[PDB]
Symmetry: C3
Subunit: 458 residues, 3 copies
């Protein structure tokens, strides 16, 4: 009696789960919104510098209109290698944002010290792998909260707390090629093994190298650590990068998971649209919304408010034809990266709509109870839109100088709605709806032409 080859089945649930971390795939929590969970772990925030520049170069004529295709190919080739290291070292990739990603090692408190060693080693091997591109890595460790928010058909999650703020601070300090530990990470780690240098004006520290003691064997140490890793592929599945590759059809589970994924990606998963379609360099408008709270580390304070804001944001975006691409803690608060002009959401009046949408969101969110300040940055231009990451773990994202510009506007001009000149000039709105603003020198930004506040009708 034969025992024939059992071919890999790439069921739709498996393709869906590629777009999500184990934190959600195997999370099985309440459908109530908001939902909050608390745990500890080590976070790794990995940034590839230079793709933003590259994006602008891939619109040039030398790319012969295959710029999007070339950009995603060279990006994924690099990012995939990083994704594999994170996964082999036992991490869960939580989210991709442009050419960066955030990974988590969730463990019990007693195991943070040893897991920190594992992550540092991971980081050094990644810093290893890496012709104009640098890798910067920030690490943090401690208490983490998760929030899930959304409505009956859409779900989103985010992580919150001091470790989340710390990992992003650590990463902003990294010079090209550094691995930086948060103060708390340094404080919890196995200092007898990890050799650091101080960072000026900073309690965070830079990793120089591992200094293992005499009888230390990393493979044996790693194996002990896998005891604590719930989803590490093992035994018969030790040849797989993710346990999620073995997920089996389950309509309840798939209904729950699909709510995290955008409709155009589900179309592609369901072989109702060609893959090529989602890799594009297209003119869009970014609307980058920031909500600042009294205490951005206290999930049960901020969770209700994010949900409240999300309910209004989503209904307004539906009307003005925009979409939430990503949400994360960023700029002392919760940020929504929204996009006008994604697959199948073209219009004329896109610019006007992005501006009217932004004002509406600003007025509403300004009044929701624990929101201290709202800031919104609007910028328009050619940006890369596509699926970034590894075959087994990837997400739809946007990369482009205008994406960064909108984020920087929202941070340097708090408490108002701002726009760039392309949006100002392009919009059908009268000039006295706007105010020309003082030019601020902005981190990471060369020369935006004039910037404007969208004052609205008075």
């Amino acid at each position: 009696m034969n025992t024939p080859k059992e071919e890999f089945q790439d069921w739709p649930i498996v393709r869906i789960a590629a777009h999500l971390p184990d934190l959600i795939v195997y999370g099985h929590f309440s459908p109530e919104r908001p939902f909050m969970d608390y745990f500890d772990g080590v976070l790794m925030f990995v940034d590839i510098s230079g793709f933003t520049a590259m994006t602008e170069k891939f619109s040039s004529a030398m790319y012969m209109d295959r710029g999007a295709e070339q950009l995603v190919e060279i990006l994924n080739y690099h990012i995939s290698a990083i994704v594999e290291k994170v996964l082999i070292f036992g991490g869960d990739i939580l989210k991709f944002a442009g050419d960066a990603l955030l990974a988590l090692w969730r463990v019990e408190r007693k195991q943070l010290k040893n897991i920190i060693t594992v992550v540092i080693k991971c980081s050094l091997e990644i810093h290893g792998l890496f012709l104009d591109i640098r890798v910067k890595i920030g690490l943090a460790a401690g208490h983490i909260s998760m929030l899930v928010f959304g409505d009956e058909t859409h779900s989103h999650f985010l992580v919150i707390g001091q470790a989340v703020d710390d990992v992003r601070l650590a990463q902003n300090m990294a010079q090209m090629n550094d691995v930086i530990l948060s103060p708390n990470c340094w404080q919890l780690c196995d200092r007898s093994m990890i050799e650091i240098e101080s960072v000026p004006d900073q309690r965070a520290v830079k990793v120089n190298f591992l200094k293992p003691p005499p009888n230390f064997n990393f493979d044996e140490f790693f194996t002990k650590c896998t005891t604590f890793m719930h989803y590490y592929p093992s035994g018969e599945h030790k040849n797989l990068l993710r346990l999620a590759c073995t997920l089996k059809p389950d309509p309840e589970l798939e209904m729950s998971l699909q709510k995290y994924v955008m409709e155009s990606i589900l179309k592609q998963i369901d072989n109702k649209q060609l893959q090529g379609y989602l890799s594009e360099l297209r003119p869009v408008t970014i609307v980058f919304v920031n909500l600042m709270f009294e205490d951005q580390d206290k999930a049960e304070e901020i969770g209700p408010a994010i949900q409240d804001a999300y309910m209004h944001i989503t209904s307004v975006l539906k009307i003005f034809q925009g979409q939430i691409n990503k949400v994360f803690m960023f700029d002392k608060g919760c940020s929504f990266l929204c996009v006008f002009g994604f697959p199948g959401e073209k219009v004329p009046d896109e610019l006007t709509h992005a501006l009217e949408c932004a004002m509406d969101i600003f007025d509403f969110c300004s009044q929701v109870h624990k929101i201290q300040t709202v800031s919104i940055g609007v910028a328009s231009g050619i940006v890369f839109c596509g699926i970034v990451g590894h075959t087994v773990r990837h997400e739809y994202t946007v990369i482009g100088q205008k994406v960064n510009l909108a984020a920087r506007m929202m941070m340097y001009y708090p408490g108002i709605v701002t726009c760039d000149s392309v949006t100002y000039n392009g919009s059908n709105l009268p000039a006295y709806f706007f105010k020309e603003l003082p030019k601020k020198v902005m981190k990471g930004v060369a020369d935006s032409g004039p910037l404007y506040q969208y004052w609205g009708r008075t």
Copy 2:
């Protein structure tokens, strides 16, 4: 000199052969129509209860318009596992009809007893594998005839005879989870090994278990049995589920095989249409045609008549824009499951056309010589249309409460054309073309609203 990896070639002929049993793939018989062949074998008829209900639930809002996708995924996940067992145990899947399939073990007469043991074991392992779904299995054994019928561009086959009637009777008696043997099967089997209980008012019997004798080893027994299995994958191809996976391009053979497959499936095979396209939950009209004969077991009596009827059915369907989905022996006769509204055959007046087509077919077939009675049931609603089965053996089929309703109408209201209320109400035809009928309690049917006879113009 290298000996490089020889990658699997999924030639078009191989993809075609996935839609057909070895009985046709390796049959090499005359292109003359009708063509009849005679042999012996054991038949297995496997039914998954509950998908029909599920279908109705997958149109609900909780499925967020991915109902078709979810339904086919969960169906195929289960059915594929059954298909693999049948194939590993040496059977040929002849046909899929909704969430059921029919499998054949064709052997010489002297080998029926031993092969019956093999099939029972197969059945018990399948009953094994199987959250609202039961598996019912009927087995029969004996003489079988095959008919091939069609025209210069389309071919169809069916099996006929007492064993075919018996396997369907056996399966209608199975309580959830039973394996039932036909009287003749019980009479030919190795009774010293097979422990049964009687079935009330019935000569068919229920399998309780296998009671192997002392030195009996199933693997060695199975291996002896493979001597008689012409196409069992072996040697270098023992890792494959079907020998058909090795078929090589042959234009003569492919011309012959493609005639069994519908044009929209050939389009997909030829990568001229996205796969997603054929899995749908769409409103259609089922026209379920039954031809009753004096003796439905005598192929050479009935074969000419089925061909005659097919020639007219197909020309009328072409005019009224319908398609034959499936043909089989069912309801004391030969049944054609026809569909109005399949990929690319949308229209308005679909309902009217289905009714005029049904009348035309009724008048013509009523006059063909050995056809004793014609019955036709017409029902309209949302039904699942798609490819069901395993990667290596699958077919296009329809599942839905309206499919069952049309079959039951055709059986409970013989000798006339009947329709449901959706069709009555929806049609552009005057009310006095119809007659409102007495409500009959029907096996498997809750509450069809009113039913009607399509009387026609008088």
Copy 3:
């Protein structure tokens, strides 16, 4: 720590490189045009007789409109097997033209004798593999030049010299199933091992068999030969047919390589169009342009002129909506196989345009300096268009009786523009723009109806 399966990545650069020989993929030469390189090698020219006939038969009704699909499947099944032998024996397939291909073994001069043995053995194994189809093979050896020509967005290459003329002469003499050596090949080969018969009126010779000496072992001999093969897959990659299967994303390299591939193929590579789309049997017009030079073996004489002609040809084709399918040395000169009506280049007035384009090209090229004679043959009909070869090495090409007719017209009627009757009759041009020509008996051609010179306006 796991070491998980590293799945084959079929990056776009890899898919591009399938369409090109190692001579270009790993060539890294100047982007200047024309560019010329010089080396030595052995050439193999392999022709499958009979597909041209088959093409005409695959338009018949028995193919039920899947003629293109069937033709490409049966063609590729045969051609793929030849491609694998060439590759396993260490050759580089340079180009496909219809049902023929040209392969190169590039080596240093001292190694030609031994490599000739390898190629003969290859040829005999191929003649081995080969229901109406014969394989004819011609071999040549010696000095070879390569020319690359084109503009900022398109590139083409060709090989030139006596060995290139010889391999095509050798192949025209081969009777069904022969392997023929050029005079120079015979002169350089290891005559103590290769047993030949003379060919009447010819210095070229026919291979009867290999006569190895006593201690000769072909595997050991082949292994010694692999020392000289730069790109032979080895070690960890010994299971691959081409080293190109391992190419890694590199935007510079991909920009350079894509210029050789037509836009509709890049569309398919980029998953922006279904694969089925490019296999077609469609009515087109072939415009077969031949440039004759004083000395067609002297690349530095002829290279500038081919570039000059290409610059004008391409701009005129752009205007009249044609495309260069292929360029090669053929008919005592450089030939351009151009096509009117390829994917997405339909029009009415196609025939007129092909004729006005041909005249324009004739007038211009007639005046470029070292071009002695221009001849152009125009023929219209149903031809097969599609990707021919092996998964790892394949190209877009055209096969059809009208392709051959246009080539034969251009050779038998030199120095003028000629057209067939379909084109004459179909064109919107007045009859006195043409002259009816004397019927010539033409090699490989049954009965073209009348042929015409396109005289133009006087």
